[PDB]
Design a protein around this ligand. Structure first.
Ligand SMILES: *[C@@]1(O)O[C@H](CO)[C@@H](O)[C@H](O)[C@H]1NC(C)=O
Ligand SMILES: [Ca+2]
Ligand SMILES: [Ca+2]
Ligand SMILES: [Zn+2]
Ligand SMILES: [Zn+2]
Lengths: 276, 397, 397, 397
């Protein structure tokens, strides 16, 4: 039914509303709760997943609809984060050391990135506009950037010596690199354990929320210094026991689901707008 | 029809000119008309009413002539004429209410009541008097196929309409583009919006357009144009197109850039105005085409630059609007307006006597439903009923 | 000029009173006028048109008199008179369009076309009939130097103007003070603002003032005054004075304190009104002086007190405004208004026949440019052309 | 106008009845008409032409009467009358070409040329003869507001239109659904297609619909309906909607299932026909609504079953079409058709004398542009010019 074309939509400003339809969303869709692997250590139970899923039945979700996964830390969750089910929300502890790496994970999963491959040996590289970033993840990434000129000579670097290159990353599981836009560069990714990837952001992701368990509330999801917005789906709650953290999520499903939406890529109507 | 106006004209003048103490030469030609009414009307008999709750009355005329021999009129001459005028003015009320209530679909311009069909004989044509009112002059010019014209003050030419159009949308409803409008009475308020404020548009300019077709051709209009839509200026929540969800609209307002208003007639540009506000004219048109565009300001103070970022969260949405208003125009078909009460006299008769819905007019005489589908079968009925309502307004307010 | 109105008055009455079947005594004095038109006009010959695309036509009058011997008029008598009226009513259209299109700068009150100069002889003065219209009565009273007056409904006395004034400013544009206004048609909306909300003013009161001078003296006006400017109530971004940068204006609105409206005439206070809203009168004035002030509220709930701090970041700016509107007034010179269409008939003739720009009127008959510099040379031309447009509206709508 | 037909009627009869050797009693009443033409026309003088390359000619009438004293007409009587007829028949050609070439926008039904305005006096009304033609009879019935009617053979009621509509599409263009049509002259050929042949439709049935609104109301039409569109039956390549790419259409043709043709008038169903082909009637309508559907055949031989698989590569596309054709109908406004040449006489005069584009008619008298926007201002001009073209066709073919 006319998948590729864009067509305008008209509609009157005097039309009666539909029904409530928040219930029917709970009957059909799925839910994924994520937690660090030390949360289940304090719980001291092998049936607490059974215990929680009895409590989700009260708020309308059926039995086989809520899925639970684990991770060790945000350093090892971020080597490959992939979100599978319809709605989900992630839970992370506050670390005063991991300032930037909490903002990297909240950049990677809360937005949507269109990505192209790269070849360090063969070509020379540059960023076109403000939406172009170099997302690189793996076991151990170390990136050195040698900027060139209009004659392809080095500026501050020797284009043969790899020691005179200029380092932006050291042994990280994930890197998002912003360099100056419009200058050809020469690259030194250790590609045996890393994988650099020319990416490009579209509009953000609508089905994931982030619960920052404890600490202050700072997350630079954007790239500029001049702004740093705190959107609807990033939030913060304090803790002493991981039981109380889980009871608050189960009690207030109807508000957390309200703040997020379905992934607009996942629909039928995006059939040639990058996701069938 | 022509003799129904001629009965009401010389009953209006008979209550005005035949007063006590006046000189006889002031009324020497009215009495020759009023006596010649009576001679034609005697011996006949009529019957009005019968539809709805309108009661059936029988009329019978047996009166005597007026005296033509005084120098100054006295109180005997006035009081013997008032009890003749008061019987005729009760007869004309019940013929005019009998005709405003009936309608036909084949030929609506013909008389429909039983009494007005009987008055259209050549026996009754000698009652004919001058035809100087606006609606009876346009009744006669249009009956010979000559060009007519009605002058209106703020004519109800637009049906009620309040809607929108989204040229760019997604289910999150946070990056939108399109127009909103209100068309009601004789006023158009259109407003175009863009949430990104043309950050990725070519040359940072977003083009808008809104085209309003009319139902009848207007002539020599006086139009006021002002560069703000004051109705689409405040934060509001709006439902979706199919009534599923709701979406939020928080405007800030720039000025409209590069405004062009065009006045079309069969696709031909009659008039055009480019960045010219205030009062304008429009000599002949039947389609109004508004065009205006949003331009991102190239220089911004630090208080402005925080409002429009490059990234996705747009909390302050840009808005550009116009406002058009027709003050007075000349049409050729009958309409409703803000000065005269001919539409209010027709509906008040039908509502009072509980009249069933007929084949032509909308239920309840809804003007929004009547100007939407304004067929030539409804135009002939609407002129026939507004003209009878104009005759009744001379005698009975 | 007086005989051009007298031709149109008895052609309007000839189509209204000479109908089929009417009594002869109803039209016994019109036929003596209509026969005496024809006797004066026979043997003469005229010529109209020639400027722009207005074509050249030649006129020649050789007609016969009407019969004065019937008792009731029949269809022979009507149809032999309609083919005489239809030649005269075509002649008057082409004389009125020949005069609305021409103009002079030395003495604009004199006739300019070739046909209207020829009708101003004493041979043609016997066609003169009654002068009962509004514009032909004020043409004669003003020609003898007696006091005249035109009655208007919402007169276009204000030229279009939308601007501002900053009494306190800096290049950051974050602590401002001044007024904003819109003057358009017959409506004034002024609004004064202060970003600090009088935190450092003496006695926490900031005084505003806005003075509007008129072009002509109005008499016995009916004025509606309401204590809010609804146009300057929403957040907007405004350019600077020289178009360099833009600045942001986010209002919250208090009530206007200590309102005084004054109505001046040669610097003398004729009327004054102090904190009195609704409908007011103004008997004689030519300058409106609005005065109102902002007062910081001394007691504030905790929801209000967060809006107005002591320090520099002011995110909610205080705003005080008024709204004035003239409903109806009596002037002495001609103007435009919202009820009658005399301005629309003049511009529609000039636009249709592609008339070049002359020495007096603005290009395109722009009313904003014409009321701005409303010289006495333009006043004599504008009255001469609105009066001819009023004569043409009796015959041809 | 009525006397221009009356000049041409008795010049046509004068060349036919005044022959050599005929008896005098055969022409005894024509000569009394022809002598009474001459008496009215003597002493007058006329002037035609002036617009475009149409030359200016002056006309002057000073002729003598015909003899009324023979028993059988001889060659002296014929040859002295032929040199009078040949001057009048040259005069009527140049008045008819002067009127077909001019137009107005205010009141187009009035005469526009200088000669036809002069013939509309009561001096020239005694030339009036019988009015028996079709266009002069409908000129008089419509001038009194009575019901008229023109009878046409294949009327050009549809403007030219050839387009399509895709109800299901993708950029590969290999699984499509929608309709195609040609509306031209008096013929509609619509064809609906579906590439999947309803393999996933509910109950294997795909519904199509095509609605054609008319410009004027037709009456008592004779319509031929045949169940195949022969124009959309062969393989072709078609461009996209915006002219970007091209797409391929390879049809095989099933029969149309469940055909319903409806004939609407103000949204009311006047006539309906369900699976009835051949000749049908339509008494009163202004909107044709075709409805037909595709049904997948439930039983298929092995030669058919290979054509329609379940998977994606569809090399043979299903197609269902209809064909409608109006043979003859009765309208009330003038149109063009396939029998008479009144449109061809109007355009041939304007093309020959290099006439500039006026305010009403399209450039070049384009009939597709004229029936698309067929305003009431164009209807009054088009009837006035087709009627003059009908008068000229009696004398000069
Ligand atoms: C819902 O049941 O009721 C609505 C009106 O009360 C109606 O508009 C809508 O169709 C219904 N929706 C469903 C399927 O629940
Ligand atoms: Ca270096
Ligand atoms: Ca960059
Ligand atoms: Zn008003
Ligand atoms: Zn044929």
């Amino acid at each position: 039914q006319n998948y590729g074309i864009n067509l305008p939509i008209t509609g009157s400003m005097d039309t009666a509303y539909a029904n409530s339809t928040q219930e029917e969303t709970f009957l059909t869709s799925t839910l994924c709760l994520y937690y660090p692997t030390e949360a289940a250590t304090e719980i001291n139970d092998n049936s607490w997943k059974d215990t929680l899923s009895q409590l989700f039945l009260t708020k309308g979700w059926p039995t086989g609809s809520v899925y639970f996964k684990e991770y060790t830390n945000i350093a090892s969750f971020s080597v490959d984060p992939q979100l599978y089910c319809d709605y989900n929300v992630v839970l992370m502890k506050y670390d005063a050391t991991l300032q930037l790496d909490m903002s990297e994970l909240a950049d990677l999963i809360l937005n949507e990135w269109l990505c192209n491959p790269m070849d360090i040996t063969l070509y020379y590289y540059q960023q076109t506009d403000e939406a172009n970033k170099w997302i690189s993840m793996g076991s151990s990434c170390t990136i050195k950037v040698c900027p060139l000129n209009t004659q392809t000579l080095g500026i501050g670097c020797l284009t043969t010596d790899a020691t005179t290159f200029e380092e932006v990353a050291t042994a990280e599981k994930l890197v998002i690199t912003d360099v100056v836009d419009g200058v050809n560069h020469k690259l030194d990714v250790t590609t045996a354990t890393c994988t650099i990837r020319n990416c490009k952001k579209l509009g953000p992701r609508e089905n994931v929320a982030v619960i920052q368990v404890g600490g202050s509330d700072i997350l630079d999801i954007t790239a500029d210094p001049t702004t740093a917005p705190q959107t609807e789906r990033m939030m913060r709650i304090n803790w002493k026991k991981w039981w109380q953290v889980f009871y608050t999520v189960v009690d207030y499903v109807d508000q957390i689901i309200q703040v997020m939406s379905k992934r607009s890529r996942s629909l039928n109507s995006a059939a040639f707008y990058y996701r069938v | 029809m022509d003799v129904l106006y001629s009965l009401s004209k010389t009953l209006k003048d008979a209550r005005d000119k035949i007063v006590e103490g006046t000189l006889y030469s002031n009324v020497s030609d009215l009495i020759q008309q009023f006596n010649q009414m009576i001679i034609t009307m005697n011996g006949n008999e009529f019957q009005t009413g019968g539809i709805g709750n309108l009661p059936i009355r029988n009329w019978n005329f047996n009166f005597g002539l007026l005296g033509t021999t005084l120098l100054n009129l006295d109180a005997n001459y006035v009081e013997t004429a008032r009890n003749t005028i008061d019987y005729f003015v009760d007869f004309v009320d019940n013929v005019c209410m009998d005709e405003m209530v009936r309608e036909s679909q084949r030929n609506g311009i013909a008389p429909q009541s039983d009494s007005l069909r009987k008055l259209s004989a050549i026996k009754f044509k000698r009652i004919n008097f001058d035809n100087s009112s606006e609606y009876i002059e346009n009744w006669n010019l249009q009956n010979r196929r000559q060009r007519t014209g009605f002058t209106f003050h703020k004519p109800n030419i637009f049906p009620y309409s309040a809607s929108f159009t989204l040229n760019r949308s997604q289910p999150a409803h946070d990056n939108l583009m399109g127009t909103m409008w209100l068309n009601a009475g004789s006023e158009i308020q259109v407003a175009g919006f863009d949430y990104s404020c043309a950050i990725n548009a070519p040359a940072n300019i977003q083009q808008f357009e809104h085209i309003v077709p009319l139902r009848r051709v207007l002539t020599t209009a006086t139009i006021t144009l002002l560069p703000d839509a004051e109705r689409f200026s405040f934060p509001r929540v709006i439902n979706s197109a199919d009534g599923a969800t709701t979406w939020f609209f928080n405007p800030v307002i720039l000025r409209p850039n590069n405004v062009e208003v065009e006045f079309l007639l069969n696709g031909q540009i009659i008039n055009t105005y480019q960045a010219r506000f205030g009062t304008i004219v429009a000599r002949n048109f039947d389609t109004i085409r508004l065009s205006f565009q949003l331009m991102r300001p190239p220089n911004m103070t630090p208080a402005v630059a925080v409002l429009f970022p490059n990234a996705q969260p747009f909390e302050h949405h840009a808005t550009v609007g116009l406002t058009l208003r027709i003050e007075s125009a000349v049409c050729e078909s009958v309409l409703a307006d803000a000065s005269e009460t001919l539409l209010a006299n027709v509906t008040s008769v039908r509502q009072e006597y509980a009249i069933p819905v007929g084949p032509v007019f909308p239920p309840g005489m809804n003007w929004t439903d009547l100007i939407t589908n304004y067929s030539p079968s409804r135009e002939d009925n609407l002129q026939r009923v507004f003209t009878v309502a104009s005759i009744r307004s001379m005698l009975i307010k």
